[PDB]
Amino acid sequence: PVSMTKTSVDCTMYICGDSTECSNLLLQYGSFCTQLNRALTGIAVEQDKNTQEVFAQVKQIYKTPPIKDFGGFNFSQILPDPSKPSKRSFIEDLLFNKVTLGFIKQYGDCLGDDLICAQKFNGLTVLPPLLTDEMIAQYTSALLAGTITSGWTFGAGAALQIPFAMQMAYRFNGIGVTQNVLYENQKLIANQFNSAIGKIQDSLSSALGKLQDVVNQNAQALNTLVKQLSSNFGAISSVLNDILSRLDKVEAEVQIDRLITGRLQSLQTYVTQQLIRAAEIRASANLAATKMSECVLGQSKRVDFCGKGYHLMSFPQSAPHGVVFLHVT
Amino acid sequence: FGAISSVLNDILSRLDKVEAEVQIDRLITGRLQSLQTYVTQQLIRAAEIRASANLAATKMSECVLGQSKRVDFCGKGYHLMSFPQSAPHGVVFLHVTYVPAQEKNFTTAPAICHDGKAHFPREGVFVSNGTHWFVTQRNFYEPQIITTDNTFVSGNCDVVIGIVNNTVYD
Amino acid sequence: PVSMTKTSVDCTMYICGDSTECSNLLLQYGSFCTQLNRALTGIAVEQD
Amino acid sequence: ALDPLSETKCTLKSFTVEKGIYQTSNFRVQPTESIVRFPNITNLCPFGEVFNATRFASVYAWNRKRISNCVADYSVLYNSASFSTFKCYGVSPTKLNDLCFTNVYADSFVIRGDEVRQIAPGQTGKIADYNYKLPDDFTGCVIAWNSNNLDSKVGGNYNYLYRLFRKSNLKPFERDISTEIYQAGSTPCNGVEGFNCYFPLQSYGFQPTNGVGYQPYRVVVLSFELLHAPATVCGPKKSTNLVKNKCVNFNFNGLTGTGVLTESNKKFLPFQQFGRDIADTTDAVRDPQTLEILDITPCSFGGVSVITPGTNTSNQVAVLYQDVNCTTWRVYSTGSNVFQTRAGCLIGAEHVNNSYECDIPIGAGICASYQQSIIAYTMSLGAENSVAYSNNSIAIPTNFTISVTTEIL
Ligand SMILES: CCCCC/C=C\C/C=C\CCCCCCCC(=O)O
Ligand SMILES: *[C@@H]1O[C@H](CO)[C@@H](O)[C@H](O)[C@H]1NC(C)=O
Ligand SMILES: *[C@@H]1O[C@H](CO)[C@@H](O)[C@H](O)[C@H]1NC(C)=O
Ligand SMILES: *[C@@H]1O[C@H](CO)[C@@H](O)[C@H](O)[C@H]1NC(C)=O
Ligand SMILES: *[C@@H]1O[C@H](CO)[C@@H](O)[C@H](O)[C@H]1NC(C)=O
Numbered sequence A: 001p002v003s004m005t006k007t008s009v010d011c012t013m014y015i016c017g018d019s020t021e022c023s024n025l026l027l028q029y030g031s032f033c034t035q036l037n038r039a040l041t042g043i044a045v046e047q048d049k050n051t052q053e054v055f056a057q058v059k060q061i062y063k064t065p066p067i068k069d070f071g072g073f074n075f076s077q078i079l080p081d082p083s084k085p086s087k088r089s090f091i092e093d094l095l096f097n098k099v100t101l102g103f104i105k106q107y108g109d110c111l112g113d114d115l116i117c118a119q120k121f122n123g124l125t126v127l128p129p130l131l132t133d134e135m136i137a138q139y140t141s142a143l144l145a146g147t148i149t150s151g152w153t154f155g156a157g158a159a160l161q162i163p164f165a166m167q168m169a170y171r172f173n174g175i176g177v178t179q180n181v182l183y184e185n186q187k188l189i190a191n192q193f194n195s196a197i198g199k200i201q202d203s204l205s206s207a208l209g210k211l212q213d214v215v216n217q218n219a220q221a222l223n224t225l226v227k228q229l230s231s232n233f234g235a236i237s238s239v240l241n242d243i244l245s246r247l248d249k250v251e252a253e254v255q256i257d258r259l260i261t262g263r264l265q266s267l268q269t270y271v272t273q274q275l276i277r278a279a280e281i282r283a284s285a286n287l288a289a290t291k292m293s294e295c296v297l298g299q300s301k302r303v304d305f306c307g308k309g310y311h312l313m314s315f316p317q318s319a320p321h322g323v324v325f326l327h328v329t
Numbered sequence B: 001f002g003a004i005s006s007v008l009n010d011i012l013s014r015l016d017k018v019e020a021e022v023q024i025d026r027l028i029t030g031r032l033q034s035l036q037t038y039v040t041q042q043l044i045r046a047a048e049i050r051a052s053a054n055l056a057a058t059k060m061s062e063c064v065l066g067q068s069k070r071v072d073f074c075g076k077g078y079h080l081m082s083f084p085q086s087a088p089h090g091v092v093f094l095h096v097t098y099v100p101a102q103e104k105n106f107t108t109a110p111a112i113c114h115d116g117k118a119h120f121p122r123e124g125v126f127v128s129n130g131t132h133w134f135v136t137q138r139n140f141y142e143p144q145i146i147t148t149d150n151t152f153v154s155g156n157c158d159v160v161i162g163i164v165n166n167t168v169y170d
Numbered sequence C: 001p002v003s004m005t006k007t008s009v010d011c012t013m014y015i016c017g018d019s020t021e022c023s024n025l026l027l028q029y030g031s032f033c034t035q036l037n038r039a040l041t042g043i044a045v046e047q048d
Numbered sequence D: 001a002l003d004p005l006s007e008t009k010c011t012l013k014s015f016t017v018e019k020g021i022y023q024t025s026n027f028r029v030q031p032t033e034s035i036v037r038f039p040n041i042t043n044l045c046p047f048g049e050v051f052n053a054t055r056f057a058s059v060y061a062w063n064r065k066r067i068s069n070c071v072a073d074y075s076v077l078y079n080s081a082s083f084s085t086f087k088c089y090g091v092s093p094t095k096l097n098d099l100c101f102t103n104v105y106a107d108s109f110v111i112r113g114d115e116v117r118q119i120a121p122g123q124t125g126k127i128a129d130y131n132y133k134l135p136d137d138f139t140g141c142v143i144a145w146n147s148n149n150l151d152s153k154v155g156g157n158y159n160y161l162y163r164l165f166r167k168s169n170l171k172p173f174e175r176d177i178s179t180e181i182y183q184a185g186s187t188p189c190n191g192v193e194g195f196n197c198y199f200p201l202q203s204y205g206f207q208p209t210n211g212v213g214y215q216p217y218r219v220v221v222l223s224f225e226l227l228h229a230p231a232t233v234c235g236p237k238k239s240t241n242l243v244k245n246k247c248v249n250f251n252f253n254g255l256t257g258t259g260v261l262t263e264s265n266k267k268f269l270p271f272q273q274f275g276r277d278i279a280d281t282t283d284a285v286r287d288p289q290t291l292e293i294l295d296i297t298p299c300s301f302g303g304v305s306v307i308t309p310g311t312n313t314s315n316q317v318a319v320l321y322q323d324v325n326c327t328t329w330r331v332y333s334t335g336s337n338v339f340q341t342r343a344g345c346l347i348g349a350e351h352v353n354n355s356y357e358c359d360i361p362i363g364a365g366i367c368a369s370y371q372q373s374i375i376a377y378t379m380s381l382g383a384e385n386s387v388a389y390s391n392n393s394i395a396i397p398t399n400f401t402i403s404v405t406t407e408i409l
Helices: A011-015 A020-025 A031-055 A090-096 A115-120 A133-150 A164-173 A179-184 A186-204 A210-230 A240-246 A249-296 B008-014 B017-064 C011-015 C020-025 C031-047 D004-012 D047-051 D113-118 D126-130
Strands: A007-009 A124-126 A313-319 A322-328 B078-087 B090-100 B103-109 B118-120 B125-128 B133-137 B140-145 D020-024 D033-037 D063-067 D085-088 D104-112 D140-146 D161-163 D201-203 D216-223 D248-252 D255-263 D274-276 D282-286 D293-297 D304-308 D318-321 D345-347 D360-363 D366-370 D374-378 D393-397 D400-408
Touching: A007 A031, A011 A031, A011 A249, A020 A240, A020 A249, A031 A133, A031 A249, A090 A133, A090 A186, A090 A313, A115 A124, A115 A210, A124 A210, A133 A249, A133 A313, A164 A179, A179 A186, A179 B118, A186 A322, A210 A249, A210 C031, A240 A249, A240 D255, A249 A313, A249 A322, A249 B017, B008 B017, B017 B078, B017 B090, B125 D393, B140 D393, C011 C031, D004 D020, D004 D304, D020 D360, D104 D113, D113 D126, D113 D216, D126 D161, D255 D282
Parallel strands: D033 D248
Antiparallel strands: A007 A124, A313 A322, B078 B090, B090 D400, B103 B125, B103 D393, B125 B133, B133 B140, D020 D304, D063 D104, D085 D140, D104 D216, D140 D216, D161 D201, D248 D255, D255 D293, D274 D282, D282 D293, D304 D318, D318 D345, D360 D366, D366 D374
């Protein structure tokens, strides 16, 4: 995982609704809403930085050639197909259709009647990301094309083309094997690679668990927030309009203050837990960026870092709120 | 915090011991909450700072006291050296790196056939200006003459895809 | 270090003891105990 | 509350604002008029048959009476009645005129003055332990007034009785009218009264020359519920017409609020008047005249953001409405420029067909900048290079550069 969901809260609409009495009573506290929203804004700003640090290493958008005259290796399942509106890959599509779930939701649609409308009617807002899925796919295709046409040269300056088998020879020399092995078992090696990519495809056409955990956690949190509005916090009622309909200005202030206190506490707890989760996400994104720099733009000698075995190469693919690395060993 | 005043001395000047305890307890509760929140956020920030400091120590050990082969760790390019400087509440690393500048194109071949034998470079690549064939190192054009000291033989010329005919010398 | 100690809390026994009045008064809040224990359970699962 | 920029300046507590984008309060809509809907009732409640009666009951056999289908206008008591004690418990008195009550029972009896303080939820004593008890969760009102000019006789009136000598304490709203001999000692009373076997009922004297504490008092206790059921009995407020598809303030049988009223597909069982959601908020209501179900929906909805180039260079701003599809209603103002990004309607910015880098992020690939006007554009990822890749060509360097960079931690 590389990113999580961004959120904003209007505290007045959550705590007091459309009531003017509660609104004026809430001005005393005042500072705490500003504090909460400062924190959430920081989180939201950090998410886009995570995405950028992972996917936007290079700023030359390399196009892939139309000959494909590689030494029998076939990257047709990982490279784009100029046929869909999502100008992305086979495997990227398979991944896209394996994770459930910013956009527009008009008043006319929610009028009368889901869970998102209930979130919105209480001041809980989800914000869209800056980079679209199409842009992330463009970035990934650029990285693929660079790796496949130049090797580890586009990461240290300008890209210097080299034939692909000549590059596999370097990468073999790097693990402690001579070149004659490669040039003498080229055909076999290419067939093995192709069958392995095919097995990946066949197993994905039938495991993305962490990317789903993230989504589920966020949804759970927001709906818990919505449900915590049925609590009384030591008062005669949870509804402000009942209180205001059977009690006067002096006797109602007590109960309204109790409710205010409790709901403020709820929001505080929400923001705290979000702060604690964003740090996990940040650590994972930093690891993913390290891996994109050390395992894709180069060749690693660290053990069990870029896979299992002796590392030869790696390919990136995008996924909702994350990245998938294909390690060739 | 739901009380008649924020000042304790007003409360204590217009209310007695029994009626003032209520309001004073309200104030106490609220201000305690404030301090708790402060301490919590400080705890959460100190962890970010700790992670950054651990990274900086790793970098001082791997990039200053040695030479790294990790990519884009100690800078951008091929790492040569690094120098540290201090700064208020932090450190600045000066990374000295090597970059290639001027590229030229050449023709290639994976091997060379002389007498029914295939030769491989063992330290570089075979290149051609168009007529003659030289052997070179990869990150700097410094062409040499193809001999038996900068090559090694393996098999015969019937399996290598792209092999070429030329003359190896002694 | 590689692991820490796992813990669980029964909130009713801590807050209200063996009293039925406090028990019935505590049902209003309700969600917060479930929340707390969700969190602690996550910690415990992460240790292993 | 002049504009979104001033909202921002008040949020930050500063007269200066720096370049960027800021989130503000949501889009609000204020009500136009006010609606009141009560039932159709004409009769006035029997204030006279209850308060201005002829003979009251004894506290041990207190009387209870139901009240229904009536208007509760109590100002008709001002000309005749003067109450010494009046106390309401789960309701404020200044609100008794704009509510509607559900299950109204009136209880009546006569007691002695010094015992009136015993008509309350706690209050142990002779009257509360053996004769009449109120519950702890009481919603209603207690009323008491002196009657030494009616229930007093010169030689002494002996027709008002109280219970002494009970075995245990009564439960709330319970009645005991038994006439049995009470055993104080252990001697086994055979239904006769000797020296430890007492008759459990006694009488008041109620002479007119007595002291104010031994004088008679008439007591009425009213009990009812609020805001959970049809509420036949109602107050003297006047009703209006029904207004739909407009934000209104409303009062439905005493329940007040704000919102838009629509027609619903729901169906209520005859013992239902209100409907709640997961958060216990009222989302549906039956009309007390037409008997049709109406859905209630709030009015404030949708996020808003402000885009500013800095107050040191301009006071021009742009505004982003995140939940609008202007292609054009729920806006604070219209203008010359509208774009309709994927992150909402953008009002106050010119759209250009080029692509630069991101200065101010908006979202979904849209950034903004200040040129003089404000422009919005799809942002740029970088340039194209198109490596060659022949199968026999190689590129090799012939020189190098020494670079020095900084990294700060
Ligand atoms: C001789 C005094 C002994 C007191 C013993 C100590 C504590 C007992 C406390 C209170 C008992 C007196 C209650 C008198 C009121 C009776 C009830 C009533 O009619 O309202
Ligand atoms: C790559 O695989 C696909 C389907 O297996 C197909 O395009 C072809 O077999 C390969 N590409 C070639 C051989 O050009
Ligand atoms: C290598 O050849 C390509 C193909 O013509 C050419 O465009 C490119 O400029 C060459 N590279 C250099 C360094 O000249
Ligand atoms: C109540 O009855 C008294 C006794 O005659 C009378 O004076 C008074 O007017 C009555 N109150 C009402 C309801 O008018
Ligand atoms: C708004 O409605 C239009 C219909 O004209 C639709 O095409 C468009 O996708 C909608 N806007 C968004 C981004 O939801």
